[PDB]
Paper text:
Here, we describe a family of relatively small proline-rich cathelicidins widespread among ruminant species. These peptides, named rumicidins, inhibit the formation of the first peptide bond presumably due to interference with the accommodation of aminoacyl-tRNA into the A site of the ribosome. Our cryo-EM data reveals that rumicidins bind to the bacterial ribosome in the NPET similar to other known PrAMPs but form unique interactions with the elements of the 50S ribosomal subunit. Ribosome-targeting proline-rich antimicrobial peptides (PrAMPs) from animals can be divided into two groups based on their origin: oncocin- and apidaecin-like peptides from insects, and cathelicidins from Cetartiodactyla mammals.
Residue numbers in the entry:
A (entry chain K): 1 to 93
B (entry chain 1): 1 to 46
C (entry chain F): 2 to 272
RNA sequence: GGACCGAACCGACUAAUGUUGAAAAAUUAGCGGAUGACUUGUGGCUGGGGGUGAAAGGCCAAUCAAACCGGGAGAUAGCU
RNA sequence: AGCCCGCUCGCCGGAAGACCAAGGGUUCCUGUCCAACGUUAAUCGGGGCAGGGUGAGUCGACCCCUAAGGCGAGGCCGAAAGGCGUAGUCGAUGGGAAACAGGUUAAUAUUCCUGUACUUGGUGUUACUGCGAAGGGGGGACGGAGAAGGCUAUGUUGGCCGGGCGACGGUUGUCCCGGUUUAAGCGUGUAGGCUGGUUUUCCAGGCAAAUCCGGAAAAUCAAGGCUGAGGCGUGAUGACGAGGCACUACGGUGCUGAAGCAACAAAUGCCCUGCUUCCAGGAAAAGCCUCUAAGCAUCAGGUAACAUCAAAUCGUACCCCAAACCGACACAGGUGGUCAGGUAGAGAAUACCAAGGCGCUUGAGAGAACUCGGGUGAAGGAACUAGGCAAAAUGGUGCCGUAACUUCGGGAGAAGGCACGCUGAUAUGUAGGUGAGGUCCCUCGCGGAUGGAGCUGAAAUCAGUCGAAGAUACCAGCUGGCUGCAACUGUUUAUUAAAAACACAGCACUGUGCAAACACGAAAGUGGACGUAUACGGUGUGACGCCUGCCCGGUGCCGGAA
């Protein structure tokens, strides 16, 4: 069993975009920003515990951060992990 | 025409990378010199 | 059989092949093979230490029994095989107990022949005995220099040694070089001459054929610059110095043997 | 078959062009090899009086009758 | 002028197309801006700014396994630093489980969705049950060339289905246009390739053991096993599908949906890691199969079926004959692998096209000299010039014909000559290739024999016919004679020298008896070589033919020693 302490840290934010929206209303899939070191197993456990929904499967990818200038002052944004969480049919969030 | 620089990341790391430098006392002296000078980049290691 | 190629191309005009129909056409006996990767004549410093070595065909090493120490047990020659590692052919022999080994193929040996090693062996080609038990005057090959060490002398195609004398613990051998040499009488030898005597009649015929055998070109010293070789230099063809090796030692008559340890065993030098 | 003709591929014999170039070695038209001592990818080994060289003092990062970088070092300069 | 849309034109098409690895790193997509950047303008951009975008049990990495090689506990060696190396441990460019078709995004997809699969492992049952390795054996597991036969990708034509009936003479037909596609998996075990099978007994082998492998001897039976492209069936009452219909936010969404066959041609792909043949004789280790040891004994473990769970992590956008990589540039350069349609063609040459992609990021005029790249040229024809430099010329296939000389192979495509388009006939399409239905047989199947419809189809001869010209374009040898040098194919001064130089097979001299000489190395060691004088090193000469004379005073080397 994954500690609840751990599960409470792994989900960071919902991800809002046209693709995320289409994923929700076509494939019953929610898109999350999750902790960089979160595994598919942890992500599944967290969503089922914290959002109280049945998860079919988690797909994940690492987004590489862009380089961005800030008044002639350059800096690289952090890489972050995105999770496409497919909910079982009948579940809603 | 074929120029002298033909990049291979594997070859780069094996020739000049951090672990190659640490492998010998002369390599470790390179790192000491570069730290002393205050280089932002000690080696080719990415 | 020695066969001259017809001159259908300049590279073929002078080729002379040794075609032996008796040699196994199939693949070698897998349990007795090992890999043997090439050196390019470079040592463990990665430096060339013997020039003119490189390339040529890949070759597997055949484990050849030079010790011939499996005594009392007869063996039958299964087949003769080509061995790329040496000038002699080799014979796959099957011992009565089921063991297979390779041996140097003596002259005359053919598939079906019986061989044996040990003191009680018969005096027939391919049989191995201590030279104590071999008649003086006999022709032998694959001769040991130290008891139990395995054959070191007379292994190349068509070579043999003559046992000229036995005096106490030692026998005197006449080697192919002409040298008269003493060896302990407990040293084993195999009766007969090494086979494939026609080996020396081969004519490679072209530059490429030497390259297949992993020999790279020799550049003459006199073709070089002084910085490269003692013979180097000159406007046109010049020489005008005593011939030497690349390292400056005289190379036409100067003797280089220097081994006081083994001098006692040499009854007479080759010349 | 280090055979022949000929593309790919590898070379580089001639000419013109170009020479503050399109290019710090090329382009165009022709040219040689093209199953071999062939060619090529990836990785590896050889280190500077050292390597490697089918030998031209060739090549060793556009650098070679002794690489490059740092040091002895403000070498020395009866010369400008 | 340069952006977008449209119509036309031109260019590439063994690429100037499509895609991988590498290398790069957001360049990708959308909106917005045009200062700078872009060799011009720019409303455009690989430019600025903002937002979005990369979804995996099966693809790759990681992982298991090793090659060259690296490192290397102890160890050996070395003033120190260090060198070398054993056990080991790393190291791919190689070996090792498994997924396909269709659909979808502005931008990902073998990753998402739909349909249909497959692999490995952990649990739990149930039944049956000798399991067990750091050890043994097998396998994995291997070259070059050649030739076929069987196939498929693919193409062509016919049939079938849908559409058309023509801006100008003709075109309801032997007419025109388009489509005619469908996977892995599963079942079947074919063309063909290889191999005798089975049961006993015995045994100096495989570091011990072995029921395994090896060896020996009988008996018995002769077809048993293994491998295998493709086809066929199923997958698929599906998917896709030319069009049509309804909407357009004039970008394109929604709905429906015909035929979906056959013949012939056919790879450089597959069967094939095959077969034949040759000498230069062609990795390793694990996974995998099998054997036992110590050990464990109605246990663990093994095998099979079923159920269940798991298969993480990282990569995944985009560029790659390049404006994104290597070349300081948005640079005529360089960059490994895969795919490869039509007509003509021997062809991956070449011409024109397809799919697809582009018109090369200054234009507009003008129509001087001169320069560059080309076209043609009266008469002459090398008179040019250092030199026929450059140009012009030759150029194909078939048949005829072909000298000196020669190492008997050559020289030779020597030289030189003739034919060559189209139409018709032989023959409404021939010789040949392919092969259906039927027929009969059968050890009734992907079978055998015959049969020969249909399809495909050279080459020749004869007769005719058009042009100045029929290898019509592109493409595509100039030829011959005497002679120096080097035998030859090769190699070389990256970037002014390709040669007569280097190498070379062959020859000779010489050293070298193996802990070899010799070489790298204060050394240990290593190469020489897991070679052994028919071998190895050094030196000179340089195929082959005929040959290689005299001098040992000098210098060297070898030997002698009173
Ligand atoms: K041999
Ligand atoms: K030579
Ligand atoms: K000289
Ligand atoms: K040198
Ligand atoms: K010279
Ligand atoms: K000279
Ligand atoms: K390489
Ligand atoms: K130097
Ligand atoms: K450099
Ligand atoms: K346009
Ligand atoms: K403008
Ligand atoms: K991993
Ligand atoms: K498959
Ligand atoms: K992708
Ligand atoms: K581009
Ligand atoms: K003008
Ligand atoms: K020609
Ligand atoms: K000549
Ligand atoms: K000559
Ligand atoms: K040349
Ligand atoms: K040369
Ligand atoms: K003399
Ligand atoms: K003398
Ligand atoms: Mg999924
Ligand atoms: Mg992923
Ligand atoms: Mg950061
Ligand atoms: Mg040599
Ligand atoms: Mg020689
Ligand atoms: Mg020279
Ligand atoms: Mg000298
Ligand atoms: Mg002279
Ligand atoms: Mg002189
Ligand atoms: Mg000297
Ligand atoms: Mg050739
Ligand atoms: Mg060159
Ligand atoms: Mg050219
Ligand atoms: Mg050619
Ligand atoms: Mg010179
Ligand atoms: Mg250079
Ligand atoms: Mg110097
Ligand atoms: Mg000083
Ligand atoms: Mg000064
Ligand atoms: Mg324009
Ligand atoms: Mg084509
Ligand atoms: Mg990459
Ligand atoms: Mg940017
Ligand atoms: Mg863009
Ligand atoms: Mg501008
Ligand atoms: Mg941009
Ligand atoms: Mg895989
Ligand atoms: Mg070591
Ligand atoms: Mg140690
Ligand atoms: Mg490993
Ligand atoms: Mg690999
Ligand atoms: Mg894309
Ligand atoms: Mg082969
Ligand atoms: Mg077909
Ligand atoms: Mg081919
Ligand atoms: Mg992609
Ligand atoms: Mg441009
Ligand atoms: Mg370019
Ligand atoms: Mg290339
Ligand atoms: Mg072309
Ligand atoms: Mg097109
Ligand atoms: Mg003009
Ligand atoms: Mg002209
Ligand atoms: Mg004229
Ligand atoms: Mg005229
Ligand atoms: Mg004339
Ligand atoms: Mg004249
Ligand atoms: Mg004149
Ligand atoms: Mg000319
Ligand atoms: Mg011309
Ligand atoms: Mg056919
Ligand atoms: Mg003359
Ligand atoms: Mg020559
Ligand atoms: Mg040549
Ligand atoms: Mg040059
Ligand atoms: Mg040149
Ligand atoms: Mg010479």
């Amino acid at each position: 069993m994954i500690r609840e302490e751990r599960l409470l840290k792994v989900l960071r934010a919902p991800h809002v975009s046209e693709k995320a929206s289409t994923a929700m209303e076509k494939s019953n899939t929610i898109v999350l920003k999750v902790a960089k070191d979160a595994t598919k197993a942890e992500i599944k456990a967290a969503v089922q515990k914290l959002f109280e929904v049945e998860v079919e499967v988690v797909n994940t990818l690492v987004v590489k951060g862009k380089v961005k200038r800030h008044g002639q002052r350059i800096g690289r944004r952090s890489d972050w992990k995105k999770a496409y969480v497919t909910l079982k049919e009948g579940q809603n969030l | 025409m074929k120029r002298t620089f033909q990049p291979s990341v594997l070859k780069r790391n094996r020739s000049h990378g951090f672990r190659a430098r640490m492998a010998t006392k002369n390599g470790r002296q390179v790192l000491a010199r570069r730290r002393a000078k205050g280089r932002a980049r000690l080696t080719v290691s990415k | 059989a020695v066969v001259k190629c017809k001159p259908t191309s300049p590279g073929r005009r002078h080729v002379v092949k040794v075609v032996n129909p008796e040699l196994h056409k199939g693949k070698p006996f897998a349990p007795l093979l090992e890999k043997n990767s090439k050196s390019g004549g470079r040592n463990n410093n990665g430096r060339i230490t013997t020039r003119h070595i490189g390339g040529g065909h890949k070759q597997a090493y055949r484990i050849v029994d030079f010790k011939r120490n499996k005594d009392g047990i007869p063996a039958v020659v299964e087949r003769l095989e080509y061995d790329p590692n040496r000038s002699a052919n080799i014979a796959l022999v099957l011992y009565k107990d089921g063991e297979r080994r390779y041996i140097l193929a003596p002259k005359g040996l053919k598939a079906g022949d019986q061989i044996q090693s040990g003191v009680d062996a018969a005096i027939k080609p391919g049989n191995t005995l201590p030279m104590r038990n071999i008649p003086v005057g006999s022709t032998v090959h694959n001769v040991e220099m130290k008891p139990g060490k395995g054959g070191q002398l007379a292994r190349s195609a068509g070579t043999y040694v003559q046992i000229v004398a036995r005096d106490g613990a030692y026998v005197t051998l006449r080697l192919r070089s002409g040298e008269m040499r003493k060896v302990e009488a407990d040293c084993r030898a195999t009766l007969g001459e090494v086979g494939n005597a026609e080996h020396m009649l081969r004519v490679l015929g072209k530059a490429g054929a030497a390259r297949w055998r992993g020999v790279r070109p020799t550049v003459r010293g006199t073709a070089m610059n002084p910085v490269d070789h003692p013979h180097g230099g000159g406007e046109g063809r010049n020489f005008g110095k005593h011939p030497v090796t690349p390292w400056g030692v005289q190379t036409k008559g100067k003797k280089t043997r220097s081994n006081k340890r083994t001098d006692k065993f040499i009854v007479r030098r080759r010349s």
